[PDB]
Amino acid sequence: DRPIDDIVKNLLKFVVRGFYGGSFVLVLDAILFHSVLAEDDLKQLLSINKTELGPLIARLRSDRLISIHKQREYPPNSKSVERVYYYVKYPHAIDAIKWKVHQVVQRLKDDLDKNSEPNGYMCPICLTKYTQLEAVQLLNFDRTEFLCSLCDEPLVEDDSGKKNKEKQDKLNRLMDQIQPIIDS
Amino acid sequence: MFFIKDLSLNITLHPSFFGPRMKQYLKTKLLEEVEGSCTGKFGYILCVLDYDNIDIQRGRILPTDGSAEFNVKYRAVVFKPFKGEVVDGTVVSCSQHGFEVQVGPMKVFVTKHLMPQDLTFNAGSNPPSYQSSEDVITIKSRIRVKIEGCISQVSSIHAIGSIKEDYLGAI
Amino acid sequence: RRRRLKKVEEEENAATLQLGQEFQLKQINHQGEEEELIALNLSEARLVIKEALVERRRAFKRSETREKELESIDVLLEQTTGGNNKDLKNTMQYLTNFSRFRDQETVGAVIQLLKSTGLHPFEVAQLGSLACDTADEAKTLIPSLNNKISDDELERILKELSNLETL
Amino acid sequence: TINQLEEDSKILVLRTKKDKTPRYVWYNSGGNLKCIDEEFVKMWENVQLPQFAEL
Amino acid sequence: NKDMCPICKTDRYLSPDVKFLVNPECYHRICESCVDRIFSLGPAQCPYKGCDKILRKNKFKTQIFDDVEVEKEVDIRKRVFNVFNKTIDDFNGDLVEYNKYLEEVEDIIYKLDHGIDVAKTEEKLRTYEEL
Amino acid sequence: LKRLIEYLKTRMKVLHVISETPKSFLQHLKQLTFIERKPLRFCSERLSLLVRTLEVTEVEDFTALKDIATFATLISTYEEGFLLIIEPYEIENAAVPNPIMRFTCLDASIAIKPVFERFSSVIITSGTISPLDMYPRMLNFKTVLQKSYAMTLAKKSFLPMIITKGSDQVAISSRFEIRNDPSIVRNYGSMLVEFAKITPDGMVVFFPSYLYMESIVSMWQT
Ligand SMILES: [Zn+2]
Ligand SMILES: [Zn+2]
Ligand SMILES: [Zn+2]
């Protein structure tokens, strides 16, 4: 069909195959194949229990990969119920993908920056951290060890800075994996 | 760094010093409560300038304690560190966590993460020191250090130093 | 006066010239008028403190080499002031060690030479305190001087500061 | 055969939670299924939405 | 890549805050955020793999030209012409000698660009700028 | 040549219109690239000599080098009567911007001055050169006699007519912003229809611009 529709279909397929499980993949692929799809339609095609699609539909709505319509009709047998329709809103969905991956990159930068300030120390007895700025208020009279304010225990070294290269590698491995997303 | 600033302090006089030389008692308690006293707002206050004319106005009696509260305004030399400022000093202690440098009245502790990697601890020396391929840093050694972090409490100020920048270190 | 919380502000950094809201360039004195923030270099601070101590010794009475200077100021300290002088003793020792200039005329020459530049008090006090040699070293020691002083002017003013350095 | 087609990412299948038993196979119209690592999956999970109409 | 910073792995599309910062000693497509993350604390080695040159924070600048070789050629030309500025007035109208001086300037610029005789040309540049 | 081309690439990355003199261009190029005017003045000659003794069979890659050498020599040896215009948009209809750099000759007398300096007798001649006194000012040359002849006819061989309005007295004009006016387009179409009906053999219709002709003929067919 329309080439931009093909591109957004492949983008939604890629993000549901990457960041979501196989049942999510099946539900969103059914949504991309049949444009609108009610709850009985998902049940008939996928043989998925109502309680099983519960977390699936809840996650897909909370990420806005699919959206819901609350229309009820009048069938000839007059046993009408307020059924729900599941479909895809392409611009809101792609905008959600951009916002999610963008701010994910943003606080990955924040996490590696927080790793990039020097490590400081932490007290194993009280399980509380103390950075280098306030450890020098807690150094001893012998001027050798930082002693905890409560436990009075010599402070041990943390690892915020030894893992900076590991965080950079994880960032790189995120980026080369999400290269199709940015191209789309 | 050293500054000169207008300062104001609320000082409390016990009623036993309500004599004809109450102003002299006020000035002496100003001396041994301000000279060398550390405040985080205005830095280490070192010496009080213009001792002949110190602004002392009327002192309010506290309604329950019965003591007199004077709002004394004075001129004093202070020493306030700032982040990112290069100061000189002398080393007074060394350890495996780092070493403290003495600038003014304040000890700036330089952590072991903030020296060049060629420079390493040597505790076998007496006193223990830091040795590199080109220089040694020991006690009573002239050294130039940049302050890149300052914490200031109500009555205590502590600073963090680093010599990893070029054209720093021993002088 | 407004009662906003105004809890958001930039961290005090020497490179950005942010020294806090009460180390601004203008200071309201005890007489009510505004005045330039008085920032002292190390030798200037040593001379101001020594002048204050000898004036206080004169008031109490009415009411040069490194070795002799240290003992002279120690006797002056113990004669003038009473208790809690560990910090002031360390300041006196630190200033007599790292005092670039000896006497009032040389240091006042440094203040007038740096006031000919029309520069920040913090920056000129840093220039008078740090025993720098070259312009690029001055720029990397004080990041505040970036895009403020030309390189030739910087190297010449540090050249006569090196000339004014004595003993 | 469904198993190696699944790790070849040629087909799509759901399995029971008790055991990996295929019951219904589809066609994988998309790409490979294991492009994104699991810690990136949780790292994606860590974020949420403030509201609707701003974006 | 000419569009993204390989050190911090950020595209210009989602992150428009990246900039075309390079260094004269080693020209690397590196961003201002990477520069402030690494070299603000102190001087360090080149984060791109296969290079380990020491470099400073204050020497970074934005690249004017698109070509790395052109950028380094004009930077070397500036580093030569700052001390080599003889003109036809300095040569007193001797056109052939001015042409020969221009030959020598382009020869030493080409030699500094290609690194063929870098030690001898650096020594000649130093002993000619000492005057 | 490579650093000159890179300087040109930097100059075309400007988001607004630059209208500058060649002297200003040369000063900016000298301060940013250390390229002088005199090596630029020999650029085309040096490129021709280099290509000659490289004896290359293919020059389809070197056509743009001819363009650059021509630009360099022109903008180097000419400084008065010329202007460099850098436009961020070559055409405003395009979505993506396409920058263009135009080195334009503002004085039409520059190219024709050596002709009048070389040749003693020049007869400027046209069927429809008017006004005649415009050309000795617009091109710096002196004319010994300028005259327009009036053709003598037994009967008036040609009929010039100026039509300022349509058949229904609606005003007609071909200014470019109202080219889509249905009344004016209909009046021009009706005029052309009647003139085609009453003209025996041939009829030539001249339009102010090709885009105008394309638009009005397309909507005439519509
Ligand atoms: Zn503890
Ligand atoms: Zn980067
Ligand atoms: Zn490198």
3-state SS string over B1-49? CEEEEEEEEEEEECHHHCCCCHHHHHHHHHHHHHCCCEECCCEEEEEEE
Which pair of structure tokens corresponds to residue A120?
């400081």
- CA–centroid distance for A90 within its chain: 19
Same domain, C165 and C119: yes
Where are the strands (E) in chain C, listed by range?
Answer: 26-28, 34-36, 38-39
Which pair of structure tokens corresponds to residue C149?
């002083």
Give the CA distances from residue A103 to residues A38, A170, F167, in Å, rounded to whole numbers and listed in that order: 33, 16, 67
Assign C152 to helix, strand or coil: helix
CB B170 within 8 A of CB B115: no
> Residue A11: how many CB atoms within 10 A of its CB?
19
Q: How far is the CA of A160 from the centre of ligand 2 (A)?
A: 20
CB B64 within 8 A of CB B130: no
Q: Which residue in B has a C-alpha nearest to residue E40's C-alpha?
A: B165
Distance to chain A for D1, nearest Cα, Å:
18
Residue F219 contacts by C-beta under 8 Å, 6 or more apart in sequence? F180, F185
Question: How many whole angstroms separate alpha carbon B114 and alpha carbon C24?
Answer: 31
Question: How many whole angstroms separate alpha carbon A38 and alpha carbon A53?
Answer: 12
Return the ligand number nearest the Cα of E32.
2
Give the CA distances from residue E107 to residues E113, E118, F29, in Å, rounded to whole numbers and listed in that order: 10, 12, 22
Relative orientation angle of helices A90-116 and A164-177, to the nearest 10 degrees: 160
Question: How many whole angstroms separate alpha carbon F217 and alpha carbon F215?
Answer: 6
Burial class (CB in 10 A: 0-12, 13-18, 19+), F201: exposed
DSSP strand pairing (B157-162 vs B106-111): parallel
Which pair of structure tokens corresponds to residue A168?
């950079």
Which pair of structure tokens corresponds to residue E112?
């500094």
Distance to chain B for C50, nearest Cα, Å:
10
* HEC sequence for chain F: CHHHHHHHHHHCCCCCCEEECHHHHHHHHHHHHCCCHHHHHCHHHHHHHHHHHHCCCCCCCCHHHHHHHHHHHHHHHCCCCEEEEEECCCCCCCCCCCCEEEEEECCCCCCCHHHHHHCCCCCCCCCCCCCCCHHHHHCCCCCCCCCCCCCCCCCCCCCCCCCCECCCCCECCCCHHHCCCHHHHHHHHHHHHHHHHHCCCCCCCCCCCHHHHHHHHHHHHC
Of the candidates B166, B100, B1, the residue with the CA atom closest to the CA atom of residue C129? B1
Q: How far is the CA of F19 from the centre of ligand 3 (A)?
A: 40
Q: Which residues of chain C lie closer than 8 angstroms to B90, CB-CB?
A: 94, 97
H or E element, residue A43: helix A39-46
Return the ligand number nearest the Cα of A168.
2
CB B110 within 8 A of CB B162: yes
**Is any Cβ of chain A less than 8 angstroms from the Cβ of B97?**
yes
Phi, psi (5° rounding) for residue B72? -90, 130
Phi, psi (5° rounding) for residue C84? 55, 55
Question: Is B164's CB within 8 Å of E56's CB?
Answer: no
Question: How many whole angstroms separate alpha carbon C14 and alpha carbon A78?
Answer: 78
Relative orientation angle of helices E95-114 and E68-81, to the nearest 10 degrees: 130
β-pair partners for B100:
B93, B109
**Is any Cβ of chain E less than 8 angstroms from the Cβ of F13?**
no
Question: How many whole angstroms separate alpha carbon E47 and alpha carbon E45?
Answer: 6
Question: How many whole angstroms separate alpha carbon A155 and alpha carbon A44?
Answer: 62
Residue F145 contacts by C-beta under 8 Å, 6 or more apart in sequence? none
Query: What b/e sequence results for B138-168 when a residue is b if at least 16 CB atoms lie within 10 Å of its CB, and e otherwise?
Result: beebbbbbbbbbbebeeeebbbbbbbbbbeb
Assign C22 to helix, strand or coil: coil
Query: Can the peptide bond before residue F131 be classed as cis, meaning omega within 30 degrees of 0?
Result: yes
Question: How many whole angstroms separate alpha carbon E70 and alpha carbon E63?
Answer: 10
Contacts 24+ apart (CB under 8 A), B134-138: B135/B169, B135/B170, B136/B170, B137/B91, B137/B94, B137/B99, B137/B169, B137/B170, B138/B91, B138/B94
Give the resolution in Å. Answer: 3.0
Q: Which residue in C has a C-alpha nearest to residue B103's C-alpha?
A: C94
Residues in chain C: 167
> Residue E52: how many CB atoms within 10 A of its CB?
11
**Is any Cβ of chain A less than 8 angstroms from the Cβ of D11?**
no
Same domain, C166 and C91: yes
Pseudo-torsion of CA B41, B46, B50, B54, nearest 10°? Answer: 50
DSSP-assigned letters across all residues of E95-130: HHHHHHHHHHHHHHHHHHHHTSSHHHHHHHHHHHH-
Question: Is E67's CB within 8 Å of F6's CB?
Answer: yes
CB E67 within 8 A of CB F1: no
Nearest neighbour of F9 by CB, restricted to E66, E77, E81: E66
How many domains are contained in chain C?
2
Question: How many whole angstroms separate alpha carbon C124 and alpha carbon C143?
Answer: 13
Question: Is D36's CB within 8 Å of A177's CB?
Answer: yes
Q: Which residue in A has a C-alpha nearest to residue D53's C-alpha?
A: A92
Burial class (CB in 10 A: 0-12, 13-18, 19+), E115: exposed
Q: Which residue in A has a C-alpha nearest to residue D35's C-alpha?
A: A18
CB A121 within 8 A of CB A130: yes
CB C89 within 8 A of CB C29: no
Q: What residue spans define the domains of chain B?
A: 1-82, 83-171
Question: How many whole angstroms separate alpha carbon C166 and alpha carbon C101?
Answer: 7
Distance to chain A for D54, nearest Cα, Å:
11
Assign C154 to helix, strand or coil: helix
Of the candidates B150, B107, B139, the residue with the CA atom closest to the CA atom of residue A141? B107
Same domain, C44 and C25: no
Angle at C23 between CA E42 and CA E39, to 5 degrees: 10
Q: Which residue has the tokens 């990355």?
A: F13
Question: How many whole angstroms separate alpha carbon F201 and alpha carbon B94?
Answer: 111
Interruption sites in chain B after residues (C→N beyond 2.5 Å): none
**Is any Cβ of chain A less than 8 angstroms from the Cβ of E15?**
yes
Question: How many whole angstroms separate alpha carbon F52 and alpha carbon C41?
Answer: 70
Task: Provide the 8-state DSSP code for C144.
Answer: G
Question: Residues of B near E (CB-CB distance < 8 A)?
Answer: 114, 116, 162, 164-166
Assign B98 to helix, strand or coil: strand
Task: Provide the 8-state DSSP code for B62.
Answer: P
Q: How far is the CA of E47 from the centre of ligand 3 (A)?
A: 7
Q: Which residues of chain A lie closer than 8 angstroms to E33, CB-CB?
A: 109
Which pair of structure tokens corresponds to residue E45?
């080695």
Which pair of structure tokens corresponds to residue A49?
């229990």
A152: left (phi over 0), alpha (psi -120 to 50) or beta: left
Interface of A with E in 18-57 (CB under 8 A): none
Phi, psi (5° rounding) for residue B115? -125, 160
Nearest neighbour of A99 by CB, restricted to D13, D35, D55: D55
Q: Which residue has the tokens 């698109």?
A: E66
Nearest neighbour of E56 by CB, restricted to B114, B162, B166: B166
Pseudo-torsion of CA F114, F120, F121, F126, nearest 10°? Answer: 10
Question: How many whole angstroms separate alpha carbon A144 and alpha carbon B82?
Answer: 25
Q: Where are the alpha helices (DSSP H) in E4-117?
A: 32-38, 68-81, 95-114
Relative orientation angle of helices E118-129 and E95-114, to the nearest 10 degrees: 130
B140: left (phi over 0), alpha (psi -120 to 50) or beta: left
Assign B92 to helix, strand or coil: strand
Domain hosting residue E21, numbered range: 4-62
H or E element, residue A29: helix A22-33
Q: Which residues of chain A lie closer than 8 angstroms to E8, CB-CB?
A: 109, 171
Question: How many whole angstroms separate alpha carbon B127 and alpha carbon F193?
Answer: 112
Question: How many whole angstroms separate alpha carbon A123 and alpha carbon B136?
Answer: 32
Of the candidates C115, C100, C110, C53, the residue with the CA atom closest to the CA atom of residue C78? C53
Distance to chain E for A165, nearest Cα, Å:
11
Same domain, C93 and C20: no
Question: How many whole angstroms separate alpha carbon F87 and alpha carbon A25?
Answer: 50
Angle at B33 between CA B29 and CA B39, to 5 degrees: 150
Assign E131 to helix, strand or coil: coil
Task: Report every protein residue that has its C-beta within 5 angstroms of ion ligand 1.
Answer: A 123, 125-126, 148, 151
> Residue E29: how many CB atoms within 10 A of its CB?
18
CA atoms within 13 A on the CB side of E65: 20
Nearest neighbour of E9 by CB, restricted to A98, A102, A172: A172
Same domain, C85 and C15: no
Question: Is A107's CB within 8 Å of D36's CB?
Answer: no
Burial class (CB in 10 A: 0-12, 13-18, 19+), D33: middle
Burial class (CB in 10 A: 0-12, 13-18, 19+), E75: buried
CB C102 within 8 A of CB C166: yes
Question: Is E41's CB within 8 Å of B166's CB?
Answer: no
Same domain, C50 and C74: yes
Phi, psi (5° rounding) for residue B3? -135, 170
Question: How many whole angstroms separate alpha carbon A13 and alpha carbon D28?
Answer: 9
Q: How far is the CA of B3 from the centre of ligand 2 (A)?
A: 40
Q: Do chains D and E touch (3 or more CB pairs under 8 A)?
A: no
β-pair partners for B146:
B86, B162
Q: Which residue has the tokens 């080695």?
A: E45
Which pair of structure tokens corresponds to residue B65?
């304690």
Domain hosting residue C25, numbered range: 1-39
Q: Do chains E and B touch (3 or more CB pairs under 8 A)?
A: yes
Q: Which residue has the tokens 């972090």?
A: B149
Provide the terminal-to-terminal Cα distance of chain B, rounded to the nearest Å: 19
Residue F215 contacts by C-beta under 8 Å, 6 or more apart in sequence? F179, F180
Give the CA distances from residue B88 to residues A171, B106, B113, C17, in Å, rounded to whole numbers and listed in that order: 40, 12, 20, 20
Nearest neighbour of E15 by CB, restricted to A105, A112, A113: A105
Pseudo-torsion of CA C1, C2, C3, C5, nearest 10°? Answer: -120
Question: Is D30's CB within 8 Å of A29's CB?
Answer: yes
CB F181 within 8 A of CB F148: no
What was the elucidation method?
Answer: cryo-EM
Q: Considering only CA atoms, give the Rg of chain E.
A: 19
Return the ligand number nearest the Cα of E30.
2
Question: How many whole angstroms separate alpha carbon B107 and alpha carbon B33?
Answer: 21
Which pair of structure tokens corresponds to residue E50?
């296969």
Question: How many whole angstroms separate alpha carbon C46 and alpha carbon C65?
Answer: 15
Interruption sites in chain C after residues (C→N beyond 2.5 Å): 63
Which pair of structure tokens corresponds to residue D45?
């999970």
Distance to chain B for E57, nearest Cα, Å:
10
- CA–centroid distance for A179 within its chain: 17
